[PDB]
Amino acid sequence: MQPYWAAIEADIERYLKKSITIRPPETVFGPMHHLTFAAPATAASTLCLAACELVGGDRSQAMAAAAAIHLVHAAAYVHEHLPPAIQHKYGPNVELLTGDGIVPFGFELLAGSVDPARTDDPDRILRVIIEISRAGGPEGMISGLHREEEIVDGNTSLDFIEYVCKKKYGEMHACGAACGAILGGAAEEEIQKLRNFGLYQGTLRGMMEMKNSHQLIDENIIGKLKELALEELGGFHGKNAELMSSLVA
Amino acid sequence: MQPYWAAIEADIERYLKKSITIRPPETVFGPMHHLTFAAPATAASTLCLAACELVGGDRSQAMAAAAAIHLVHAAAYVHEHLPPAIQHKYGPNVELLTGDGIVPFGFELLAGDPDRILRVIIEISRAGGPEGMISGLHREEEIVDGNTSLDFIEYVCKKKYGEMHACGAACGAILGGAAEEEIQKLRNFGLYQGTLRGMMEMKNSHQLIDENIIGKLKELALEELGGFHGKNAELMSSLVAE
Amino acid sequence: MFDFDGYMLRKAKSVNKALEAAVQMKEPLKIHESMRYSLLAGGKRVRPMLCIAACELVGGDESTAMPAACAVEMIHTMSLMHDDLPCMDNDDLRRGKPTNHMAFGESVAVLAGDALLSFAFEHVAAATKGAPPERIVRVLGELAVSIGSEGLVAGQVVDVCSEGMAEVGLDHLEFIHHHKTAALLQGSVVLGAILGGGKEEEVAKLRKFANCIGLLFQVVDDILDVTKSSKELGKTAGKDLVADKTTYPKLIGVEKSKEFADRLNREAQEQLLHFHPHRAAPLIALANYIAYRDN
Amino acid sequence: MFDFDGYMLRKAKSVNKALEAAVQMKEPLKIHESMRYSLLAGGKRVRPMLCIAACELVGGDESTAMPAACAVEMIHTMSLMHDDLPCMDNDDLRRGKPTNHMAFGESVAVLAGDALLSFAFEHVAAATKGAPPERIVRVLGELAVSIGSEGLVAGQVVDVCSEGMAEVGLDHLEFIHHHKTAALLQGSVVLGAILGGGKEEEVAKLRKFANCIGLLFQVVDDILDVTKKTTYPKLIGVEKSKEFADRLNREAQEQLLHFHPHRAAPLIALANYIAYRDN
Ligand SMILES: C=C(C)CCOP(=O)(O)OP(=O)(O)O
Ligand SMILES: CC(C)=CCSP(=O)(O)OP(=O)(O)O
Ligand SMILES: CC(C)=CCSP(=O)(O)OP(=O)(O)O
Ligand SMILES: [Mg+2]
Ligand SMILES: [Mg+2]
Ligand SMILES: [Mg+2]
Ligand SMILES: [Mg+2]
């Protein structure tokens, strides 16, 4: 619960720091390092490691994906935050470019994590690069960031807002869980279930990020989503098999 | 146009007349009859009969589907013209309701072998639904005469005409008993041919549609027709060529 | 003893869950948001419930009837969306909220309505399980016939054109209500009985049944339009008091209309004697509810 | 070779056909419309051609390298869509026509660009046929290396932070040109070369070829500007810049010596072209 989920985030951050070394030219790696760890963590990364271990995989098998996922998320975060709305350590131009350096670095980490002594690595990695690129592409995350700008604080329906959160956060979390199951060696039914769970978990999650502003927070939407989420976990019976149900608290 | 297509278009008219006869109450069947033929002829309807004839089957097997496709088109047409942008023969409420009655009649003709009819109802219903022709009607309300790109306009045409044509070709290949690989080829042919027809007619509006867009859709269509042969294959090709 | 409220509560709950899962938000967002705004607004769900009850009455099970049940509730909803439009009745309240067109525009409202009708056919066709293709095709046909020019629509068009006749006979007012309200309730009951495996004789009895409650439903809708306030009904009430529409509370009065609703009910229930009272209890309760509801 | 212009024309055409098919108009319409606006604006397509050329050079066929070919053009496209943004170079035009954010707005242009960047990986990864998985993954890695913090982006970032610093030495100028131009040409040749089945030794020669002609391009543009800040002429003179160009061109071509002459010809043709342009 508290300790397990925290150790996951700490492992993900420890992998990132080891991977992104501030070295010359600091004008490039300084902002790349700063912006990667200034973005809030995304449960999508966490879910990736959790799902890999849930199916019998070793945590190290999904670390590169978990990291790729946080990086796509961070780039997205930086880009939605410019305009000069507030004070930023790095100027708008270096933030945008760095967002463009963070995404490919995610793929580099993944391609570079193929162990040639492991014969099942290429196929599983190729498939995950496809998942992450789709989830953070024009039919996923990007769809949500775009539609989000149509939301008028107190004059937008709940149906539309949930759609924005399914695209903005749900697609990514579904990705996270599925990639975790794939890298863990899970069979298709397992992967599908975990994907679906992730989809609802992420949508619910995003729904809470929305609360703050458009306070119209309906407990029914929260019940329909958590309910659907849990109705997907029918097969995995245990703690981790029923722990996932902890964020939904 | 061409007499082969005018001939097939006319067999469909005869069947629609044969099926929709004015009778009491006439305040219902008059508008139904009138509005069915007030809608322009759609090639989505004749493609069905053709695609079916191109794969060994006889058009008499795809007639009901061809008719349904037309009626689905009629209803959409009626609806995209409620106001009196002009002087209609019937009031906005009778037109509105007649469209609502046209579509079910298309399904009624089909319901009246059953594994393919089921598959066709799914095709037509999906093509006339929120994710097909209606997405096109909806997005079209946005096209500003000289402020809208060709990319956006081609899209609306793909949704408004393309999907119904792709669907016509598909239902025809399905009804003639063609194989999956063939249905897809024909479905794609319809898709492009229909998008093409939409561009021709959208040309009348703002004349900025270069022959490059037209050649692309043309080329994409015939490429899909590769693999087919015979008289009927060239007749099918004259739908985009000529 | 049969608890009708607990029955209607779980069946409505089950139908609203399938409706919500059947019509999801997706591009084009406005079309879908408008489809959902009216569909999940909050109707009594009499039609799908009748569909499911008829299915379970002949041996079938809810899951086979659910897609069809949602389909009649979709077409029912779109027929109301269009009915409220400025060129039809121009109403401003429906299912407790502003009418669709007031919230999305006449264009989207019209479109969303059309999408519901179309999708109803897709859904039943592609999602129904526990019935062979022939059954499905057949059901789709009854659905078609009940809402088209020999069904719902005919009733609604003869209703807007017969909005002038001040000499309407009980045969012109009969035609109106049977087509614009009975035909869909007939389709709802029939759809479920066929998908339930029912035999021709049973289906025929039930059709005759739906007929009586179908006319009963309308007769009662006209009384509610003359005795209840718009807030209460959740929709715009009263415009049948002025407009020269063909209603029962006019050509015979409200009290004689009530009386009539009473005969209609008894007749419907007398059709149900075809079945064992134990299995007929749900449809018997739905028939009363249709009779004594307050909205 | 013969008709080098006709060869380039055929490659761009075939590539323009694959790009159009890969990035279709779809919901959300403004994001796809924006992607297509800058991706299909037509151009020379030297990057896709370098990828294809490199594939057939080592024995592969165009078909196999096509998705990767479109990928590098996608990348090139979004790097330009972003370079024009208000916070960057803030330009209203590019190739005589309005920049992406001028017709779609800043927000959409930023996001359209991001879409092209991630779709490039999705497309190479899921559409490449005729190659084992470890081969396509290896190529995704190479693409990622050539466009990130040690490739394109670095060039773009070091350029952005060096515009108020008038005094800049040769080493600094070569860093920017290498990363901002060569890095993506190198990635293009190495994706083709590896998808075509080439050997490590063949891939390594090609990597040198790309680096030589990418730099060659920047030195020649500096020579023509003066024979029509910091430039090769201002640092070492036109005389030297030209010596350097000829040396860059010779070394590039020396790399193609042990390849079949016929397959190598288009590439050799491309080096001379860049080397002897008149504009
Ligand atoms: C009287 C007719 C034909 C329609 C209104 O019916 P309903 O009363 O069934 O309305 P809802 O419950 O669905 O809201
Ligand atoms: C019968 C159909 C399709 C719609 C309603 S007829 P009506 O206007 O009498 O009913 P409403 O008051 O609008 O509910
Ligand atoms: C070549 C790359 C990566 C970016 C644009 S370079 P630039 O802004 O110096 O010049 P242009 O706008 O390409 O004319
Ligand atoms: Mg009304
Ligand atoms: Mg009423
Ligand atoms: Mg620049
Ligand atoms: Mg520039």
Integer CA distances (angstroms), D142 to A105, A109, D117, D196, in order: 11, 11, 14, 15
Phi, psi of A153 (to 5 degrees): -5, -70
Catalogue the E-assigned strands of A152-199. Answer: none
Residues with CB under 6 A from ligand 2: C 79-80, 83, 89, 152, 156, 180-181, 221, 235
Per-residue DSSP letter, C182: I
Ligand nearest to the CA of D84: 7
C33 in contact with chain A, both atoms CB, cutoff 8 A: yes
How far is it, in rounded angstroms, from Cα D156 to Cα A32?
A: 13
- D225 labeled binding residue: yes
* D121-159 per-residue burial string, b: 16 or more CB within 10 A, e: under 16: bbbbbbbbeebebbbbbbbbbbbbbbbbbbbbbbbbbbb
Could you tell me the domains of chain C? 1-295 (1.10.600.10)
Q: DSSP code of C94? A: E
Separation between Cα atoms, residue B220 and residue B187, nearest integer Å: 12
Looking at the complex, does the CB of residue C141 fall below 8 Å from at least one CB of chain D? Answer: no
Q: Which residues contact B22 (CB under 8 A, 6 or more apart)?
A: B29, B30, B33
The answer on whether C240 is annotated among ligand-binding residues is: yes
Secondary structure letter of residue B41 according to DSSP: P
Distance from CA of D33 to the nearest CA of B (A): 7
List all residues 6 or more positions away from D198 whose beta carbon is below 8 Å from its beta carbon. Answer: D54, D57, D58, D59, D60, D206
Alpha carbon B84 to chain centroid, angstroms: 25
Q: Computed over its alpha carbons, how large is the radius of gyration of chain D?
A: 18
- Cβ separation B93–C160 shorter than 8 A: yes
Number of inter-chain CB pairs under 8 A, B vs C = 143
Q: Cα torsion at A54, A60, A65, A71 (round to 10°)?
A: 120
Measured from the CA of C234, which atom of ligand 1 is nearest?
A: 14
Residue B237's CB: how many other CB atoms inside 10 A? 15
Query: In ligand 3, which atom is closest to the CA atom of D180?
Result: 3
The answer to whether A19 and A66 have CB atoms below 8 angstroms apart is no
Interatomic CA distance for residues D98 and D108, integer angstroms:
15
User: What distance in Å separates the CA atoms of residue A82 and residue A41, rounded to the nearest whole number?
Assistant: 19
Tell me if C108 sits within 8 A of C34, measured CB to CB: yes
Residue found under tokens 């890999």: A52
A-C C-beta contacts closer than 8 Å: 16
Residue nearest to atom 8 of ligand 1 (CA): C295
Q: Rounded to a whole number, what is the distance in Å from the CA of C28 to chain D's nearest CA?
A: 8
Measure the CA–CA gap between A37 and A41, rounded to whole angstroms: 8
Question: Among A196, A212, A192, A200, which residue's Cα sits nearest to residue A247?
Answer: A200
Q: φ, ψ for residue D98 (rounded to 5)?
A: -55, 135
Q: Cα–Cα distance between B153 and B166 in angstroms, integer?
A: 18
Residue nearest to atom 3 of ligand 1 (CA): C181
Decide if C28 contacts B130 (C-beta within 8 A): yes
Closest CA to A232 of A248, A220, A219: A248
Q: Indicate contact of A with B: 3+ CB pairs under 8 A.
A: no
Tokens, residue D240: 């030297």
Residue D111: CB atoms within 10 Å: 27
Q: List, in sequence order, every beta strand (DSSP E) within C115-235.
A: none
DSSP conformation class of B40:
P
Number of domains in chain B: 1
Q: Whose CA is nearest to atom 3 of ligand 3?
A: D180
Q: How far is A133 from chain C (nearest CA, A)?
A: 21
Answer yes or no: do D28 and C28 touch at CB < 8 A: no
Q: Residue B4 sits in which domain range?
A: 1-242
Q: Is C170 exposed, middle or buried (0-12, 13-18, 19+ CB in 10 A)?
A: exposed
User: ∠D166-D170-D175 over CA atoms, to 5°?
Assistant: 95
Look at residues A211, A206, A220 and name the one whose alpha carbon lies nearest to residue A174: A206
Coil, helix or strand for C185?
helix
Which residues from A are below 8 Å from D111, CB to CB?
79, 142, 145-146
Q: From the CA of B122, how far away is ligand 4's center (Å)?
A: 31
In whole angstroms, give the CA distance from residue B127 to residue B134: 9
Q: What sign results for the dihedral spanned by CA atoms B195, B196, B197, B202?
A: positive
CA distance C60 to B191: 41
Contact at CB, A159 and C25, closer than 8 angstroms? yes
User: Residue written as tokens 């998985």?
Assistant: D133
Cα A29 to ligand 6 centre (Å) = 19
- Any known ligand binding at D89? yes
Q: Which residues of A127-140 are buried (b: 16+ CB within 10 A; e: fewer)?
A: bbbbbbbbbbbbbb
CB contact under 8 A, D154 and A101: yes
| CA separation for the pair A149, A15 (Å, rounded) | 34
* Ligand 1 probe mutation, C80, C97, C286, most atoms within 8 A of CB: C80
Q: Is C97 helix (H, G, I), strand (E, B) or coil?
A: strand
Tell whether ligand 1 has an atom less than 6 A from the beta carbon of residue C95: yes
Neighbouring residues of B107: CB distance < 8 A, sequence distance ≥ 6: B68, B121, B124, B125, C121, C140, C141, C143, C144
Query: How is chain D classified by DSSP, letter by letter?
Result: ---HHHHHHHHHHHHHHHHHHHS---SSHHHHHHHHHHHSS----HHHHHHHHHHHHTT--HHHHHHHHHHHHHHHHHHHHHHHSTTTT--SEETTEE-HHHHH-HHHHHHHHHHHHHHHHHHHHHH--SS-HHHHHHHHHHHHHHHSTTSHHHHHHHHHTTSS-----HHHHHHHHIIIIIHHHHHHHHHHHHHTT--HHHHHHHHHHHHHHHHHHHHHHHHHHHT----HHHHHHHHHHHHHHHHHHHHHHHTTTTS-HHHHHHHHHHHHHHHH---
Q: Among C177, C188, C156, which Cα is nearest to C222's?
A: C177
Residues with CB under 5 A from ligand 7 (ion): D 83, 89
Q: How far is CA D177 from CA B182, D181, D223, in A?
A: 51, 6, 15
- C92 labeled binding residue: no
Q: Per the CB < 8 Å rule, is D33 touching B216? A: no
Could you tell me which residues are beta bridge partners of residue B228? B226
How many angstroms does the Cα of residue C36 sit away from the middle of ligand 5? 23
Q: Tell me, in Å, the resolution of the deposited structure.
A: 2.3
Is D166 at the interface with chain B, CB within 8 A?
Answer: no
Determine if ligand 3 sits within 6 Å of the CB of residue D83. Answer: yes
Closest atom of ligand 2 to CA, residue C80? 4
* Structure-determination approach: X-ray
CA dihedral C184, C189, C194, C200 (to 10 degrees): -100
Q: What CATH number does residue B164 fall under?
A: 1.10.600.10
DSSP assignment letter at B160: I
Chain D, 9 to 28: residues with Cβ < 8 Å from chain C are: 27-28
CA C180 to ligand 2: nearest atom = 1
Q: How far is residue A100 from each of residues A79, A133, A139, C126, D174, measured CA to CA in Å?
A: 9, 14, 19, 44, 22
